[PDB]
mmCIF file of all heavy atoms in Angstrom:
data_model
loop_
_atom_site.group_PDB
_atom_site.id
_atom_site.type_symbol
_atom_site.label_atom_id
_atom_site.label_comp_id
_atom_site.label_asym_id
_atom_site.label_seq_id
_atom_site.Cartn_x
_atom_site.Cartn_y
_atom_site.Cartn_z
ATOM 1 N N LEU V 1 9.396 -0.581 -6.868
ATOM 2 C CA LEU V 1 10.186 0.041 -7.942
ATOM 3 C C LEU V 1 9.536 1.234 -8.487
ATOM 4 O O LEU V 1 8.337 1.266 -8.689
ATOM 5 C CB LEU V 1 10.496 -1.008 -9.028
ATOM 6 C CG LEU V 1 11.293 -2.299 -8.668
ATOM 7 C CD1 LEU V 1 11.308 -3.278 -9.756
ATOM 8 C CD2 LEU V 1 12.773 -1.985 -8.447
ATOM 9 N N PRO V 2 10.256 2.231 -8.884
ATOM 10 C CA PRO V 2 9.707 3.395 -9.554
ATOM 11 C C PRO V 2 8.639 3.044 -10.660
ATOM 12 O O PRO V 2 7.617 3.537 -10.725
ATOM 13 C CB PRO V 2 10.875 4.232 -10.095
ATOM 14 C CG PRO V 2 11.910 3.952 -9.081
ATOM 15 C CD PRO V 2 11.764 2.428 -8.836
ATOM 16 N N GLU V 3 8.967 2.088 -11.533
ATOM 17 C CA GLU V 3 8.086 1.726 -12.632
ATOM 18 C C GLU V 3 6.839 1.027 -12.220
ATOM 19 O O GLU V 3 5.747 1.155 -12.806
ATOM 20 C CB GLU V 3 8.784 0.755 -13.563
ATOM 21 C CG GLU V 3 9.484 -0.458 -13.058
ATOM 22 C CD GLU V 3 11.025 -0.262 -12.595
ATOM 23 O OE1 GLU V 3 11.455 0.859 -12.115
ATOM 24 O OE2 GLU V 3 11.812 -1.363 -12.723
ATOM 25 N N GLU V 4 6.867 0.330 -11.090
ATOM 26 C CA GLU V 4 5.682 -0.274 -10.606
ATOM 27 C C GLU V 4 4.710 0.814 -10.024
ATOM 28 O O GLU V 4 3.457 0.769 -10.241
ATOM 29 C CB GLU V 4 5.959 -1.357 -9.531
ATOM 30 C CG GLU V 4 6.827 -2.495 -10.113
ATOM 31 C CD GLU V 4 7.444 -3.334 -9.046
ATOM 32 O OE1 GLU V 4 8.004 -2.801 -8.034
ATOM 33 O OE2 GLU V 4 7.385 -4.623 -9.057
ATOM 34 N N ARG V 5 5.299 1.641 -9.287
ATOM 35 C CA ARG V 5 4.594 2.781 -8.603
ATOM 36 C C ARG V 5 3.976 3.608 -9.740
ATOM 37 O O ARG V 5 2.825 4.160 -9.530
ATOM 38 C CB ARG V 5 5.523 3.618 -7.749
ATOM 39 C CG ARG V 5 6.057 2.774 -6.515
ATOM 40 C CD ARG V 5 7.210 3.490 -5.835
ATOM 41 N NE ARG V 5 6.697 4.808 -5.216
ATOM 42 C CZ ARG V 5 7.349 5.757 -4.794
ATOM 43 N NH1 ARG V 5 8.669 5.759 -4.880
ATOM 44 N NH2 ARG V 5 6.754 6.797 -4.342
ATOM 45 N N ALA V 6 4.860 3.869 -10.796
ATOM 46 C CA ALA V 6 4.382 4.706 -12.004
ATOM 47 C C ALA V 6 3.157 4.055 -12.555
ATOM 48 O O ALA V 6 2.102 4.691 -13.101
ATOM 49 C CB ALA V 6 5.407 4.913 -13.001
ATOM 50 N N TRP V 7 3.121 2.745 -12.700
ATOM 51 C CA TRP V 7 1.947 2.016 -13.360
ATOM 52 C C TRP V 7 0.784 2.351 -12.415
ATOM 53 O O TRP V 7 -0.317 2.549 -12.847
ATOM 54 C CB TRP V 7 2.167 0.512 -13.529
ATOM 55 C CG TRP V 7 0.854 -0.164 -13.903
ATOM 56 C CD1 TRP V 7 0.466 -0.077 -15.205
ATOM 57 C CD2 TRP V 7 -0.035 -0.618 -13.254
ATOM 58 N NE1 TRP V 7 -0.762 -0.661 -15.347
ATOM 59 C CE2 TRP V 7 -1.152 -0.990 -14.072
ATOM 60 C CE3 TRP V 7 -0.288 -0.899 -11.825
ATOM 61 C CZ2 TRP V 7 -2.380 -1.580 -13.609
ATOM 62 C CZ3 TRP V 7 -1.545 -1.617 -11.305
ATOM 63 C CH2 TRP V 7 -2.500 -1.832 -12.250
ATOM 64 N N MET V 8 0.962 2.228 -11.097
ATOM 65 C CA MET V 8 -0.292 2.519 -10.172
ATOM 66 C C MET V 8 -0.748 3.926 -10.360
ATOM 67 O O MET V 8 -2.001 4.180 -10.441
ATOM 68 C CB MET V 8 0.088 2.304 -8.662
ATOM 69 C CG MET V 8 0.286 0.828 -8.460
ATOM 70 S SD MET V 8 0.380 0.400 -6.692
ATOM 71 C CE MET V 8 -1.461 0.646 -6.220
ATOM 72 N N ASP V 9 0.085 4.918 -10.619
ATOM 73 C CA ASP V 9 -0.225 6.259 -10.991
ATOM 74 C C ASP V 9 -1.173 6.279 -12.219
ATOM 75 O O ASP V 9 -2.138 6.937 -12.144
ATOM 76 C CB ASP V 9 0.922 7.322 -11.082
ATOM 77 C CG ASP V 9 1.776 7.389 -9.905
ATOM 78 O OD1 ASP V 9 1.181 7.342 -8.788
ATOM 79 O OD2 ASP V 9 2.946 7.726 -10.085
ATOM 80 N N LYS V 10 -0.670 5.546 -13.273
ATOM 81 C CA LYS V 10 -1.341 5.573 -14.576
ATOM 82 C C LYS V 10 -2.696 4.959 -14.403
ATOM 83 O O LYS V 10 -3.685 5.410 -14.897
ATOM 84 C CB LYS V 10 -0.479 4.787 -15.546
ATOM 85 C CG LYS V 10 -1.105 4.642 -17.061
ATOM 86 C CD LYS V 10 -0.242 3.684 -17.599
ATOM 87 C CE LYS V 10 -0.804 3.387 -19.135
ATOM 88 N NZ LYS V 10 0.195 2.468 -19.809
ATOM 89 N N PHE V 11 -2.764 3.861 -13.506
ATOM 90 C CA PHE V 11 -4.042 3.193 -13.338
ATOM 91 C C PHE V 11 -5.064 4.120 -12.689
ATOM 92 O O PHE V 11 -6.121 4.404 -13.183
ATOM 93 C CB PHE V 11 -3.777 1.928 -12.400
ATOM 94 C CG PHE V 11 -4.957 1.243 -11.894
ATOM 95 C CD1 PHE V 11 -6.081 1.140 -12.418
ATOM 96 C CD2 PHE V 11 -4.761 0.569 -10.559
ATOM 97 C CE1 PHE V 11 -7.288 0.369 -11.865
ATOM 98 C CE2 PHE V 11 -5.736 -0.059 -10.022
ATOM 99 C CZ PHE V 11 -7.015 -0.130 -10.672
ATOM 100 N N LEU V 12 -4.738 4.735 -11.562
ATOM 101 C CA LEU V 12 -5.564 5.646 -10.928
ATOM 102 C C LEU V 12 -5.959 6.866 -11.818
ATOM 103 O O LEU V 12 -7.259 7.212 -11.784
ATOM 104 C CB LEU V 12 -5.093 6.129 -9.598
ATOM 105 C CG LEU V 12 -4.701 4.953 -8.551
ATOM 106 C CD1 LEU V 12 -4.388 5.540 -7.210
ATOM 107 C CD2 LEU V 12 -5.916 4.035 -8.374
ATOM 108 N N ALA V 13 -4.981 7.340 -12.578
ATOM 109 C CA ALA V 13 -5.346 8.463 -13.496
ATOM 110 C C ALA V 13 -6.441 8.143 -14.517
ATOM 111 O O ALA V 13 -6.972 9.019 -15.124
ATOM 112 C CB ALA V 13 -4.007 9.030 -14.053
ATOM 113 N N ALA V 14 -6.494 6.760 -14.824
ATOM 114 C CA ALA V 14 -7.566 6.340 -15.811
ATOM 115 C C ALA V 14 -8.924 6.444 -15.233
ATOM 116 O O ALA V 14 -9.915 6.234 -15.960
ATOM 117 C CB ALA V 14 -7.212 4.981 -16.288
ATOM 118 N N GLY V 15 -9.066 6.823 -13.942
ATOM 119 C CA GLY V 15 -10.262 7.161 -13.381
ATOM 120 C C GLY V 15 -10.755 6.044 -12.324
ATOM 121 O O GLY V 15 -11.880 5.601 -12.216
ATOM 122 N N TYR V 16 -9.890 5.665 -11.385
ATOM 123 C CA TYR V 16 -10.133 4.705 -10.392
ATOM 124 C C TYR V 16 -9.582 5.316 -8.990
ATOM 125 O O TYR V 16 -8.531 6.161 -9.108
ATOM 126 C CB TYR V 16 -9.411 3.354 -10.704
ATOM 127 C CG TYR V 16 -9.779 2.724 -11.902
ATOM 128 C CD1 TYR V 16 -9.094 2.947 -13.152
ATOM 129 C CD2 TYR V 16 -10.900 1.698 -12.095
ATOM 130 C CE1 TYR V 16 -9.574 2.414 -14.375
ATOM 131 C CE2 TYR V 16 -11.216 1.150 -13.232
ATOM 132 C CZ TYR V 16 -10.472 1.442 -14.433
ATOM 133 O OH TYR V 16 -10.802 0.925 -15.547
ATOM 134 N N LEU V 17 -10.295 4.914 -7.969
ATOM 135 C CA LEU V 17 -9.934 5.321 -6.685
ATOM 136 C C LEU V 17 -9.429 4.295 -5.905
ATOM 137 O O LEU V 17 -9.920 3.134 -5.810
ATOM 138 C CB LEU V 17 -11.147 5.887 -6.034
ATOM 139 C CG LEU V 17 -11.904 6.978 -6.749
ATOM 140 C CD1 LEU V 17 -13.176 7.344 -6.095
ATOM 141 C CD2 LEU V 17 -11.066 8.211 -6.967
ATOM 142 N N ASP V 18 -8.390 4.645 -5.037
ATOM 143 C CA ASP V 18 -7.765 3.685 -3.982
ATOM 144 C C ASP V 18 -8.681 3.841 -2.757
ATOM 145 O O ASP V 18 -8.638 4.906 -2.049
ATOM 146 C CB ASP V 18 -6.331 4.086 -3.756
ATOM 147 C CG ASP V 18 -5.624 3.228 -2.501
ATOM 148 O OD1 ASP V 18 -6.314 2.661 -1.810
ATOM 149 O OD2 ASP V 18 -4.466 3.440 -2.496
ATOM 150 N N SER V 19 -9.566 2.877 -2.504
ATOM 151 C CA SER V 19 -10.677 3.201 -1.497
ATOM 152 C C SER V 19 -10.175 3.497 -0.156
ATOM 153 O O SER V 19 -10.753 4.370 0.530
ATOM 154 C CB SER V 19 -11.677 1.952 -1.463
ATOM 155 O OG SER V 19 -11.095 0.773 -1.064
ATOM 156 N N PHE V 20 -9.141 2.773 0.355
ATOM 157 C CA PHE V 20 -8.697 3.193 1.724
ATOM 158 C C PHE V 20 -8.341 4.676 1.807
ATOM 159 O O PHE V 20 -8.592 5.235 2.837
ATOM 160 C CB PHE V 20 -7.426 2.299 1.967
ATOM 161 C CG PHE V 20 -7.040 2.454 3.490
ATOM 162 C CD1 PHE V 20 -7.786 1.948 4.525
ATOM 163 C CD2 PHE V 20 -5.823 3.269 3.692
ATOM 164 C CE1 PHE V 20 -7.285 2.117 5.781
ATOM 165 C CE2 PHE V 20 -5.420 3.406 5.008
ATOM 166 C CZ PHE V 20 -6.113 2.891 6.051
ATOM 167 N N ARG V 21 -7.754 5.023 0.714
ATOM 168 C CA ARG V 21 -7.283 6.643 0.683
ATOM 169 C C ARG V 21 -8.463 7.567 0.477
ATOM 170 O O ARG V 21 -8.254 8.791 0.641
ATOM 171 C CB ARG V 21 -6.129 6.705 -0.411
ATOM 172 C CG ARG V 21 -4.845 5.950 0.024
ATOM 173 C CD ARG V 21 -4.338 6.432 1.415
ATOM 174 N NE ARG V 21 -3.073 5.712 1.728
ATOM 175 C CZ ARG V 21 -2.544 5.599 2.936
ATOM 176 N NH1 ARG V 21 -3.220 5.984 4.026
ATOM 177 N NH2 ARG V 21 -1.504 4.979 3.022
ATOM 178 N N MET V 22 -9.671 7.021 0.196
ATOM 179 C CA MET V 22 -10.858 7.979 0.044
ATOM 180 C C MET V 22 -11.065 8.543 1.582
ATOM 181 O O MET V 22 -11.655 9.511 1.639
ATOM 182 C CB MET V 22 -12.058 7.213 -0.292
ATOM 183 C CG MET V 22 -11.931 6.914 -1.906
ATOM 184 S SD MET V 22 -13.314 5.991 -2.438
ATOM 185 C CE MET V 22 -14.674 7.049 -2.233
ATOM 186 N N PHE V 23 -10.574 7.885 2.558
ATOM 187 C CA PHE V 23 -11.050 8.168 3.901
ATOM 188 C C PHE V 23 -9.836 8.396 4.822
ATOM 189 O O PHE V 23 -10.029 9.113 5.826
ATOM 190 C CB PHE V 23 -12.011 7.153 4.534
ATOM 191 C CG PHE V 23 -13.248 6.948 3.726
ATOM 192 C CD1 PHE V 23 -13.225 5.729 2.948
ATOM 193 C CD2 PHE V 23 -14.266 7.631 3.776
ATOM 194 C CE1 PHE V 23 -14.260 5.461 2.224
ATOM 195 C CE2 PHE V 23 -15.513 7.386 2.971
ATOM 196 C CZ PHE V 23 -15.444 6.141 2.247
ATOM 197 N N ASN V 24 -8.667 7.744 4.633
ATOM 198 C CA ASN V 24 -7.667 7.638 5.646
ATOM 199 C C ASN V 24 -6.295 8.040 4.867
ATOM 200 O O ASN V 24 -5.806 7.215 4.142
ATOM 201 C CB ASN V 24 -7.590 6.474 6.256
ATOM 202 C CG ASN V 24 -6.653 6.448 7.486
ATOM 203 O OD1 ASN V 24 -5.665 7.248 7.491
ATOM 204 N ND2 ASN V 24 -6.792 5.468 8.314
ATOM 205 N N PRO V 25 -5.734 9.257 5.167
ATOM 206 C CA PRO V 25 -4.540 9.704 4.574
ATOM 207 C C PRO V 25 -3.224 9.217 5.343
ATOM 208 O O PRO V 25 -2.070 9.483 4.859
ATOM 209 C CB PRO V 25 -4.616 11.191 4.632
ATOM 210 C CG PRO V 25 -5.400 11.308 5.889
ATOM 211 C CD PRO V 25 -6.485 10.291 5.956
ATOM 212 N N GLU V 26 -3.421 8.558 6.472
ATOM 213 C CA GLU V 26 -2.352 8.324 7.386
ATOM 214 C C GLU V 26 -1.428 7.054 7.038
ATOM 215 O O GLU V 26 -1.857 6.120 6.399
ATOM 216 C CB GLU V 26 -2.786 8.110 8.840
ATOM 217 C CG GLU V 26 -3.710 9.357 9.258
ATOM 218 C CD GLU V 26 -4.339 9.071 10.587
ATOM 219 O OE1 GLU V 26 -4.141 8.041 11.305
ATOM 220 O OE2 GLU V 26 -4.979 10.162 11.127
ATOM 221 N N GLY V 27 -0.145 7.274 7.398
ATOM 222 C CA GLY V 27 0.831 6.091 7.309
ATOM 223 C C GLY V 27 0.564 5.164 8.431
ATOM 224 O O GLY V 27 -0.281 5.253 9.276
ATOM 225 N N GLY V 28 1.583 4.100 8.399
ATOM 226 C CA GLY V 28 1.403 2.957 9.336
ATOM 227 C C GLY V 28 0.375 1.889 9.129
ATOM 228 O O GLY V 28 0.001 1.092 9.864
ATOM 229 N N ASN V 29 -0.295 2.292 7.936
ATOM 230 C CA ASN V 29 -1.475 1.417 7.520
ATOM 231 C C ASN V 29 -0.996 0.323 6.496
ATOM 232 O O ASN V 29 -0.799 0.746 5.305
ATOM 233 C CB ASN V 29 -2.698 2.310 7.064
ATOM 234 C CG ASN V 29 -3.255 2.926 8.222
ATOM 235 O OD1 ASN V 29 -3.867 2.314 9.051
ATOM 236 N ND2 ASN V 29 -3.285 4.346 8.101
ATOM 237 N N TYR V 30 -0.718 -0.846 6.866
ATOM 238 C CA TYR V 30 -0.169 -1.905 6.014
ATOM 239 C C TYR V 30 -1.022 -3.210 5.995
ATOM 240 O O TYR V 30 -1.842 -3.360 6.895
ATOM 241 C CB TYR V 30 1.184 -2.163 6.528
ATOM 242 C CG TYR V 30 2.092 -0.948 6.813
ATOM 243 C CD1 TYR V 30 2.761 -0.838 8.083
ATOM 244 C CD2 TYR V 30 2.273 0.023 5.891
ATOM 245 C CE1 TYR V 30 3.469 0.202 8.215
ATOM 246 C CE2 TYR V 30 3.152 1.005 6.021
ATOM 247 C CZ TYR V 30 3.678 1.182 7.336
ATOM 248 O OH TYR V 30 4.477 2.338 7.541
ATOM 249 N N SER V 31 -0.806 -3.981 5.005
ATOM 250 C CA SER V 31 -1.511 -5.209 4.808
ATOM 251 C C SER V 31 -0.690 -6.390 4.713
ATOM 252 O O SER V 31 -1.107 -7.509 4.436
ATOM 253 C CB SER V 31 -2.453 -5.113 3.695
ATOM 254 O OG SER V 31 -1.732 -5.058 2.491
ATOM 255 N N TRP V 32 0.713 -6.212 4.827
ATOM 256 C CA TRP V 32 1.672 -7.351 4.713
ATOM 257 C C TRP V 32 2.834 -7.140 5.581
ATOM 258 O O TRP V 32 3.336 -5.882 5.705
ATOM 259 C CB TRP V 32 2.081 -7.446 3.189
ATOM 260 C CG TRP V 32 3.148 -8.553 3.030
ATOM 261 C CD1 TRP V 32 2.930 -9.899 2.942
ATOM 262 C CD2 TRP V 32 4.588 -8.473 3.225
ATOM 263 N NE1 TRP V 32 4.110 -10.633 2.773
ATOM 264 C CE2 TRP V 32 5.235 -9.825 3.035
ATOM 265 C CE3 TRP V 32 5.457 -7.349 3.363
ATOM 266 C CZ2 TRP V 32 6.565 -10.021 3.142
ATOM 267 C CZ3 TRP V 32 6.824 -7.622 3.563
ATOM 268 C CH2 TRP V 32 7.326 -8.921 3.399
ATOM 269 N N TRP V 33 3.364 -8.144 6.178
ATOM 270 C CA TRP V 33 4.548 -8.007 6.979
ATOM 271 C C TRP V 33 5.243 -9.296 6.825
ATOM 272 O O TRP V 33 4.730 -10.458 6.673
ATOM 273 C CB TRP V 33 4.292 -7.975 8.546
ATOM 274 C CG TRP V 33 3.302 -6.784 8.901
ATOM 275 C CD1 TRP V 33 3.620 -5.604 9.484
ATOM 276 C CD2 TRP V 33 1.841 -6.851 8.725
ATOM 277 N NE1 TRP V 33 2.499 -4.799 9.631
ATOM 278 C CE2 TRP V 33 1.420 -5.555 9.237
ATOM 279 C CE3 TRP V 33 0.926 -7.783 8.348
ATOM 280 C CZ2 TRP V 33 -0.033 -5.309 9.296
ATOM 281 C CZ3 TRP V 33 -0.398 -7.393 8.373
ATOM 282 C CH2 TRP V 33 -0.845 -6.199 8.871
ATOM 283 N N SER V 34 6.659 -9.311 6.750
ATOM 284 C CA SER V 34 7.496 -10.447 6.746
ATOM 285 C C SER V 34 7.116 -11.346 7.910
ATOM 286 O O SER V 34 6.739 -10.896 9.040
ATOM 287 C CB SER V 34 8.949 -10.029 6.709
ATOM 288 O OG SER V 34 9.801 -11.122 6.943
ATOM 289 N N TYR V 35 7.376 -12.623 7.698
ATOM 290 C CA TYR V 35 7.365 -13.663 8.933
ATOM 291 C C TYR V 35 8.562 -13.551 9.738
ATOM 292 O O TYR V 35 8.726 -14.204 10.722
ATOM 293 C CB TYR V 35 7.237 -15.067 8.424
ATOM 294 C CG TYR V 35 5.866 -15.344 7.714
ATOM 295 C CD1 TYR V 35 5.788 -15.713 6.396
ATOM 296 C CD2 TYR V 35 4.785 -15.648 8.571
ATOM 297 C CE1 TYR V 35 4.571 -16.220 5.790
ATOM 298 C CE2 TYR V 35 3.553 -16.105 7.893
ATOM 299 C CZ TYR V 35 3.552 -16.367 6.627
ATOM 300 O OH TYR V 35 2.257 -16.914 6.048
ATOM 301 N N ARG V 36 9.550 -12.628 9.328
ATOM 302 C CA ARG V 36 10.836 -12.483 10.144
ATOM 303 C C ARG V 36 10.287 -12.150 11.595
ATOM 304 O O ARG V 36 9.304 -11.366 11.786
ATOM 305 C CB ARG V 36 11.600 -11.345 9.608
ATOM 306 C CG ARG V 36 12.405 -11.620 8.391
ATOM 307 C CD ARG V 36 13.136 -10.306 7.912
ATOM 308 N NE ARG V 36 12.284 -9.148 7.540
ATOM 309 C CZ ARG V 36 12.057 -8.198 8.553
ATOM 310 N NH1 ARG V 36 12.615 -8.202 9.689
ATOM 311 N NH2 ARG V 36 11.006 -7.260 8.081
ATOM 312 N N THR V 37 11.006 -12.719 12.568
ATOM 313 C CA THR V 37 10.505 -12.626 13.953
ATOM 314 C C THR V 37 10.294 -11.068 14.418
ATOM 315 O O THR V 37 11.230 -10.278 14.167
ATOM 316 C CB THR V 37 11.579 -13.222 14.840
ATOM 317 O OG1 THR V 37 11.666 -14.667 14.567
ATOM 318 C CG2 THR V 37 11.199 -12.989 16.369
ATOM 319 N N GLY V 38 9.139 -10.781 14.897
ATOM 320 C CA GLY V 38 8.759 -9.479 15.336
ATOM 321 C C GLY V 38 8.356 -8.390 14.260
ATOM 322 O O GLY V 38 7.920 -7.439 14.611
ATOM 323 N N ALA V 39 8.476 -8.728 13.067
ATOM 324 C CA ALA V 39 8.162 -7.702 11.920
ATOM 325 C C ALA V 39 6.749 -7.272 12.060
ATOM 326 O O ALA V 39 6.570 -5.980 12.049
ATOM 327 C CB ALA V 39 8.516 -8.191 10.580
ATOM 328 N N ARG V 40 5.794 -8.219 12.216
ATOM 329 C CA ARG V 40 4.356 -7.828 12.306
ATOM 330 C C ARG V 40 4.104 -7.093 13.581
ATOM 331 O O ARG V 40 3.463 -6.042 13.568
ATOM 332 C CB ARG V 40 3.520 -8.894 12.125
ATOM 333 C CG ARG V 40 1.983 -8.487 12.010
ATOM 334 C CD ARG V 40 1.141 -9.678 11.545
ATOM 335 N NE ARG V 40 -0.337 -9.285 11.398
ATOM 336 C CZ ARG V 40 -1.110 -10.033 10.791
ATOM 337 N NH1 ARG V 40 -0.870 -11.038 10.189
ATOM 338 N NH2 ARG V 40 -2.360 -9.546 10.679
ATOM 339 N N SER V 41 4.708 -7.576 14.653
ATOM 340 C CA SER V 41 4.552 -6.867 15.940
ATOM 341 C C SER V 41 4.984 -5.476 16.055
ATOM 342 O O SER V 41 4.425 -4.470 16.641
ATOM 343 C CB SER V 41 5.091 -7.719 17.099
ATOM 344 O OG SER V 41 5.244 -7.000 18.214
ATOM 345 N N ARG V 42 6.122 -5.219 15.271
ATOM 346 C CA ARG V 42 6.736 -3.870 15.226
ATOM 347 C C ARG V 42 6.168 -3.088 14.135
ATOM 348 O O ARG V 42 6.602 -1.900 13.794
ATOM 349 C CB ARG V 42 8.272 -3.952 14.979
ATOM 350 C CG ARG V 42 8.991 -4.454 16.288
ATOM 351 C CD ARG V 42 10.457 -4.601 16.199
ATOM 352 N NE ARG V 42 10.770 -5.808 15.548
ATOM 353 C CZ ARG V 42 11.170 -6.065 14.279
ATOM 354 N NH1 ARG V 42 11.284 -4.982 13.487
ATOM 355 N NH2 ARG V 42 11.455 -7.278 13.804
ATOM 356 N N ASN V 43 5.177 -3.619 13.311
ATOM 357 C CA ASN V 43 4.510 -2.992 12.271
ATOM 358 C C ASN V 43 5.419 -2.476 11.111
ATOM 359 O O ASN V 43 5.275 -1.577 10.500
ATOM 360 C CB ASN V 43 3.675 -1.698 12.789
ATOM 361 C CG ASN V 43 2.588 -1.494 11.769
ATOM 362 O OD1 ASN V 43 2.027 -2.357 11.096
ATOM 363 N ND2 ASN V 43 2.231 -0.176 11.641
#
């Protein structure tokens, strides 16, 4: 949701770093997938 994403903006702007993004700008990098058949395999 926009408001959830906006809160993350506000958090980082308070002086915090998203560590993964310190080194890797690329998409396709996820940490959760539905258990729906094949979702994790299809990334």
Side-chain angles (χ1 to χ4, degrees):
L1 298 169
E3 53 265 38
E4 297 167 317
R5 298 170 63 196
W7 175 83
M8 292 195 71
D9 291 333
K10 177 189 177 178
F11 169 34
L12 299 186
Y16 303 87
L17 305 176
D18 178 345
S19 64
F20 188 73
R21 294 306 182 194
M22 291 173 68
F23 304 99
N24 189 340
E26 301 176 0
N29 285 301
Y30 310 129
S31 66
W32 178 86
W33 309 256
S34 174
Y35 288 113
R36 283 176 304 101
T37 300
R40 184 166 181 165
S41 167
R42 287 178 279 103
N43 203 30

